[PDB]
Amino acid sequence: GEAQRRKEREELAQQYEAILRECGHGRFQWTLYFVLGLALMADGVEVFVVGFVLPSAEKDMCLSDSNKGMLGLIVYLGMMVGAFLWGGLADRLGRRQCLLISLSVNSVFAFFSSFVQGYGTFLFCRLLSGVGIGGSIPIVFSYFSEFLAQEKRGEHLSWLCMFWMIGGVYAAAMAWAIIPHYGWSFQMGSAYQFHSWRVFVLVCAFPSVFAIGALTTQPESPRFFLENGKHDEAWMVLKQVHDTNMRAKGHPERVFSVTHIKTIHQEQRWGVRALSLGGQVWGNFLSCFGPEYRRITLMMMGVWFTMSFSYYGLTVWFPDMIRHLQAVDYASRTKVFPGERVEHVTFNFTLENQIHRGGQYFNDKFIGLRLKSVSFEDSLFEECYFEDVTSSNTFFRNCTFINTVFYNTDLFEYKFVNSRLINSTFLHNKEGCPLDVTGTGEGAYMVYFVSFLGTLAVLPGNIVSALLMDKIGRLRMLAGSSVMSCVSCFFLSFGNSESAMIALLCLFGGVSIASWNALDVLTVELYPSDKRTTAFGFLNALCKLAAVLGISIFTSFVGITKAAPILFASAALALGSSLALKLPETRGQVLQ
Amino acid sequence: TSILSIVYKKDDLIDLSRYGAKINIGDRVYYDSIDKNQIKLINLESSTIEVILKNAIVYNSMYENFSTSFWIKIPKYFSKINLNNEYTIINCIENNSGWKVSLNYGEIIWTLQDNKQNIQRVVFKYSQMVNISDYINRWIFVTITNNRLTKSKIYINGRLIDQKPISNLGNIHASNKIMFKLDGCRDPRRYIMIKYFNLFDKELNEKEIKDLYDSQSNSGILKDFWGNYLQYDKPYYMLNLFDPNKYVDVNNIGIRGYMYLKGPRGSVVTTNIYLNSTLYEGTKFIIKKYASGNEDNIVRNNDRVYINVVVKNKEYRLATNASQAGVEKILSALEIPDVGNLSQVVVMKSKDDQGIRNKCKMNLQDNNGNDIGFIGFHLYDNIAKLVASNWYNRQVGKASRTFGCSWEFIPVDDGWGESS
Ligand SMILES: *[C@@H]1O[C@H](CO[C@@H]2O[C@@H](C)[C@@H](O)[C@@H](O)[C@@H]2O)[C@@H](O[C@@H]2O[C@H](CO)[C@@H](O)[C@H](O)[C@H]2NC(C)=O)[C@H](O)[C@H]1NC(C)=O
Ligand SMILES: *[C@@H]1O[C@H](CO)[C@@H](O)[C@H](O)[C@H]1NC(C)=O
Ligand SMILES: *[C@@H]1O[C@H](CO)[C@@H](O)[C@H](O)[C@H]1NC(C)=O
């Protein structure tokens, strides 16, 4: 019974390989490659948006802490949910169908977030956008694999990973080209403001829309039709493949010789379907953990979780360390002016990164001064007058104000730390957030640069992995890349400047990419065609959960010590490599 | 029912009751110029108000009931000197026995004493960290009812706040002389104002107390923010009670120009003492006579007057165009000699139709004596615009709650201390 089923499966797996070898590799495969490349480039774009718009959104929406942290993850949690959901539904509805639905969901919530004004609504919209783009990588790889013969399958599937780089580069370029124009203050509605970062959000939503447009012109995979008992549709799609390939070759006269194809025999109402769909998807998910796939699935779980944890941790750690080194340098350059007595003068200034201690100010007028990272400590202001005071990271500690007037100032209640005001008057206070919101200027440019260099270091690795996947093997590529990632993790000790961090980021990014390519190929090849997207979706959800855990842990260790990140990353990658070396070889086998 | 009642007369203070109580006044007790009946006491020894009763009206009985009533205006406490500084203002204690009235930081204290040195205290407390207070530097009608059988109660503005039993007390022998003087205050610049001090030989009920409250309130005369008489040719800052966090402002001058409620208000702060809201923000509203037959500068009920708005230290006029779209008429500030026939005469209202006392209402009227409506505010496209509409009169006729027809007039006072 079960053995009979398995025999039928293996028979279909050989005939389909024969049909694909007859069809040949050509124009159809490359067209589909570019279409699904757009789908994957959307995914590549999506993970940069909130990181690039947080410096502007924090001031424009009054974002506190624990509110810029849950927006730095929310995409990963959304992709966690989306990956599992759409990968599960792709084996009951179809790869192309579920890809269309997920991409549309991603695009819709993305344009909508481009306009949302609050934070909770923006968090929800961007979570749903993450849910929509989460099913792109499982579905895409499991969809492209069902059109490839075994001769060059690792190479053709590995070329498909250039697209995530092409999306990262796109995001960096558009952030550089759009966000720095802070002047743009388009006004539609008095209570609402439309800045440049929203324009960036829209332009980042665009590639998903293009992906939907491109995908609407491709056929469903014939293997999905064959598994589900639909024979005519699969025959039609295979004929289309053969016709396109042969027309492109230059011989549009030969005939598709396959006449009959082996097919797997199949043995209010809205809610009825909803239940049946749920039951079938759950059955597929548990059958992924069956006697035939329980060892394989568990090493896949280990490998995916360990690699994701290390990769995401270090990738979020490198820019944090760069900022921390910049902050340390900025604190080292601070000026201190101990003891002052200024009296009877109108005295503005544009002072940055200073500390005044022990001052005594009497009858002073402070008109039109900009304060950036200026602290007044142990000071006394008596019949003073502040007008048109712009304050950024400015505090008054242990200060005493007597008969002073704050006219047209942004000196809110949080800027006077353990102060004493006597007969003080606040008039015409400026509009601002209730709490400190910080401010990022020129650093944005260099941030973009860094991104551009961390998604370009990946390029040599992509090229080499794609070229050598078929010659060397998946296990050897995965192992040889995970080990060298571990060695790079050890090298993280010998860097304490920002340039060193940039070089180390480039090195680690260039090294880990081959491993991730190998793992994508391996997890496509290792599952039957009736569970490929359910399995690949579950293991890509596990990846996003590991991402969340690793990001949190590795940002918790910034400025404390370097030993914790090095040890965690090296341990995780060593365990991942050890588990990966225990996986079966799938090179030179039919796609069963 | 009154035994002692200090009132004003021709350059002297007398008693209205048929007892002719001797009154002695110190050489530094001051009086107001307009409401010279109310008296001010400063923190000096010579600021002495001395009243002597007769031997037949001395409180020396054992279940004799008594009550007192007065108005008090106590300024803002500015610094930390005033904290925990209970000082007596009214003393009627001889041989450590009698009744007394004392004050603390934001408190009014009623204390009565017996021959056995038993202390019973009733307290009213009012916050001073509030945005806009109904007690700080504003006249308060305080009366105390003492029932020797059950308990004593405190009443402010005709309402009860606190009450404590006094059944433990056996016999109270009050002094034959009542002392009105600040005693035990370390602040050299601290003063109070009291007026209309009366004595009763029976515990007053709520009905009689409310009757006295409205009788002494002078409902026929308009009262400013501080509770004093509202006066002609005196600049007043304007506060709308229903939206008290915005101040009257201008943007332009003319028919096209309009006046609106701009906010929010600022703050005056002395850390851990007071965090009030600035009351000296906006444009002043001077009131000029139009048809007042009275010689004095006191503004009374049903007086048709003009409104002068001080913009950039320049006087203008309040006028509207009666013939315009909608029911509410947008208020505008116009040049005094360029008003033409625009509706500018306003009727000032002190009490309702039934005679019930309420806040200040301005009833704009045309030259034909037609009621355009009470002056208020209506929101245009998220802007609070000063409007005059009949709708307020409609709610008044239907005995509903009007929204925006009540105003307060805030002059500059020394008891508030805000820097302008
Ligand atoms: C806080 O101010 C009050 C009121 O003074 C006003 O506000 C000042 C900031 C300044 O602008 C003055 O010109 C204002 O008149 C002070 O209380 C009064 O102080 C004056 C002396 O300027 C004195 O003549 C009064 O008697 C004081 N009134 C009372 C009831 O004490 C107050 O002292 C100020 N706070 C401190 C710590 O000085
Ligand atoms: C403010 O400072 C500038 C120079 O930094 C000076 O020229 C100017 O006069 C100052 N402001 C006023 C109103 O004096
Ligand atoms: C600053 O130091 C302490 C508060 O930490 C305080 O005692 C001291 O008086 C302050 N300095 C001045 C000049 O007030």
> Coil, strand, or helix at residue A179?
coil
> Coil, strand, or helix at residue A409?
strand
Tell me: do B166 and B98 sit in the same domain. yes
- H or E segment and range at residue A66: none
Phi and psi at B298, nearest 5°, equal: -80, 130
CB pairs under 8 A between A and B: 37
Atom of ligand 1 nearest to the CA of B187: 31
- Residue A554 CA to its chain's centroid (Å): 16
Residue B287's alpha-carbon distances to A17, A39, B284, B306, B363, in angstroms, are 99, 74, 10, 6, 14
Phi and psi at A427, nearest 5°, equal: -140, 135
CATH 2.160.20.80, chain A: domain bounds: 332-427
Rounded to whole angstroms, the Cα distance separating A528 from A64 reads 47
**C-beta of residue A498 within 8 angstroms of C-beta of residue A322:** yes
Comparing C-alpha atoms, which of B343, B350, B355 is closest to residue B299? B350
**C-beta of residue B382 within 8 angstroms of C-beta of residue B246:** no
- H or E segment and range at residue A524: helix A498-525
Tell me: do B246 and B144 sit in the same domain. no
Rounded to whole angstroms, the Cα distance separating A217 from A214 reads 6
- Neighbour-count burial for A474-496, b at 16+ CB within 10 Å, e otherwise: bbbbbbbbbbbbbebbeebeebe
Tell me: do B256 and B389 sit in the same domain. yes
Amino acid, res. B274: Y
Measure A436 CA to nearest chain B CA, in Å.
21
Rounded to whole angstroms, the Cα distance separating A402 from A417 reads 16
Instruction: State the CATH number of the domain containing residue B101.
Output: 2.60.120.200
Neighbours of B295 (CB within 10 A): 6
Name the β-bridge partners of B120: B112
Q: Per the structure block, which two tokens stand in for B117?
A: 């040195």
Phi and psi at B226, nearest 5°, equal: -75, -10
Measure A404 CA to nearest chain B CA, in Å.
10
Residue B313 lies in a domain: yes
> Coil, strand, or helix at residue B47?
coil
| Residue contact B419–A425, C-beta within 8 A | yes
Cβ contacts of A428 on chain B, cutoff 8 Å = 266
Ligand 2, from A348, A351, A388, A389: best to mutate by most atoms within 8 Å of Cβ?
A348
Tell me: do B279 and B390 sit in the same domain. yes
Phi and psi at A341, nearest 5°, equal: -140, 95
Of A420, A422, A426, the CB nearest to B267: A426
Q: Is A422 on the interface with B (CB under 8 A)?
A: yes
Residues of B with CB under 8 A from a CB of A: 78-79, 266-271, 278, 281, 382, 417-419
> Coil, strand, or helix at residue A244?
helix
Rounded to whole angstroms, the Cα distance separating B346 from A550 reads 73
Q: Which residues contact A142 (CB under 8 A, 6 or more apart)?
A: A90, A95, A524, A532, A533, A536
**C-beta of residue B110 within 8 angstroms of C-beta of residue B122:** yes
Residue B232 lies in a domain: no
Ligand 1, from B77, B193, B419, B420: best to mutate by most atoms within 8 Å of Cβ?
B419
Rounded to whole angstroms, the Cα distance separating A316 from A323 reads 12
Q: Is A206 on the interface with B (CB under 8 A)?
A: no
Residue A515's alpha-carbon distances to A519, A558, A576, in angstroms, are 6, 26, 11
Peptide bond into B264 cis (omega under 30): yes
**C-beta of residue B140 within 8 angstroms of C-beta of residue B134:** no
Of A190, A421, A428, the CB nearest to B269: A421
Tell me: do B11 and B131 sit in the same domain. yes
| Residue contact B266–A426, C-beta within 8 A | yes
Neighbours of B3 (CB within 10 A): 19
Rounded to whole angstroms, the Cα distance separating B190 from B182 reads 9
Residue B184 lies in a domain: yes
Q: Is A350 on the interface with B (CB under 8 A)?
A: no
From B216, B248, B272, give the residue that closes a domain. B216
Residue B119's alpha-carbon distances to B90, B97, B173, B250, in angstroms, are 16, 10, 14, 57
- H or E segment and range at residue A228: none
Residue B376's alpha-carbon distances to B316, B351, B373, in angstroms, are 19, 17, 9
Rounded to whole angstroms, the Cα distance separating B358 from B349 reads 9
Q: Per the structure block, which two tokens stand in for A93?
A: 């509805």
**C-beta of residue A515 within 8 angstroms of C-beta of residue A474:** no
> Coil, strand, or helix at residue B341?
coil
Q: Find residues 372-411 of chain A whose CB sits inside 8 Å of chain B.
A: 403, 405
**Residue A399 alpha carbon to ligand 3 centre in Å:** 8
In CATH, the architecture of A1-219 is Up-down Bundle (1.20)
Cβ contacts of B418 on chain A, cutoff 8 Å = 425
Burial class of B319 by CB neighbour count within 10 A (0 to 12, 13 to 18, 19+): buried
Atom of ligand 1 nearest to the CA of B417: 4
> Coil, strand, or helix at residue B234?
coil
| Residue contact A426–B419, C-beta within 8 A | no
Name the domain count of chain B.
2
Alpha helices in A159-294 (DSSP H): 162-178, 196-215, 222-227, 231-249, 269-288
Tell me: do B252 and B110 sit in the same domain. no
Q: Token pair 């002043």 is at which residue?
A: B284
Q: Token pair 């179809």 is at which residue?
A: A94
**Residue A398 alpha carbon to ligand 3 centre in Å:** 6
CATH 1.20.1250.20, chain A: domain bounds: 1-219
Tell me: do B125 and B195 sit in the same domain. yes
**C-beta of residue A535 within 8 angstroms of C-beta of residue A288:** yes
Tell me: do B79 and B144 sit in the same domain. yes
Neighbours of A46 (CB within 10 A): 27
Cβ contacts of A426 on chain B, cutoff 8 Å = 266-269, 278
Interface test with B, best of A401, A408, A423 (most B CBs within 10 A): A423
| Residue contact A425–B417, C-beta within 8 A | no
- Residue B54 CA to its chain's centroid (Å): 33
Atom of ligand 1 nearest to the CA of B75: 30
**Residue A345 alpha carbon to ligand 3 centre in Å:** 25
Q: Is the dihedral of CA B136, B137, B143, B146 positive or negative?
A: positive
Measure B78 CA to nearest chain A CA, in Å.
8
**Residue A421 alpha carbon to ligand 1 centre in Å:** 14
**C-beta of residue A39 within 8 angstroms of C-beta of residue A211:** yes
Alpha helices in A362-497 (DSSP H): 443-454, 458-472, 474-491
Tell me: do B284 and B157 sit in the same domain. no
Residue B63 lies in a domain: yes
Residue B309 lies in a domain: yes
Ligand 3, from A356, A362, A378: best to mutate by most atoms within 8 Å of Cβ?
A378
Q: Pseudo-torsion of CA B318, B321, B325, B328, nearest 10°?
A: 30
Length of chain A: 592
Q: Which residues contact A180 (CB under 8 A, 6 or more apart)?
A: A196, A444, A445
**C-beta of residue A493 within 8 angstroms of C-beta of residue A562:** yes
Tell me: do B256 and B184 sit in the same domain. no
Q: Token pair 């490599």 is at which residue?
A: A577
**C-beta of residue B141 within 8 angstroms of C-beta of residue B216:** yes
Point out residues after which chain B has a gap (C–N over 2.5 Å): none
Name the β-bridge partners of B333: B318
Tell me: do B184 and B318 sit in the same domain. no
Measure B267 CA to nearest chain A CA, in Å.
5
DSSP designation for A194: B
Q: Which residues contact B345 (CB under 8 A, 6 or more apart)?
A: B290, B304, B305, B306, B364, B365, B366, B367
Comparing C-alpha atoms, which of B84, B419, B409, B106 is closest to residue B269? B419
From B159, B186, B216, give the residue that closes a domain. B216
Strands A400-402 and A380-382: parallel
The ligand minimizing its distance to the Cα of A388 is 2
Atom of ligand 3 nearest to the CA of A379: 13
Residue B142 lies in a domain: yes
Cβ contacts of A419 on chain B, cutoff 8 Å = 271
Please give the residue range of the domain that contains residue B281.
237-410
Q: Is A420 on the interface with B (CB under 8 A)?
A: yes
Interface test with A, best of B268, B281, B380 (most A CBs within 10 A): B268
Pocket residues for ligand 1 (CB within 6 Å)? A 403, 422-423; B 75, 78-79, 189, 417, 419
Instruction: State the CATH number of the domain containing residue B242.
Output: 2.80.10.50
Helix and strand numbers, DSSP H then E, in chain B? 2, 32
CA atoms within 13 A on the CB side of A217: 10
Tell me: do B207 and B346 sit in the same domain. no
Comparing C-alpha atoms, which of A259, A264, A265 is closest to residue A235? A259
Q: Which residues contact A308 (CB under 8 A, 6 or more apart)?
A: A542, A543, A544, A546, A547, A550
**C-beta of residue A256 within 8 angstroms of C-beta of residue A244:** no
Enter the CATH code of domain A332-427: 2.160.20.80
Comparing C-alpha atoms, which of A338, A377, A384, A378 is closest to residue A361? A384
Phi and psi at A283, nearest 5°, equal: -60, -45
Residue B230 lies in a domain: no
**C-beta of residue A308 within 8 angstroms of C-beta of residue A540:** no
DSSP designation for B301: T
List the determination method. cryo-EM
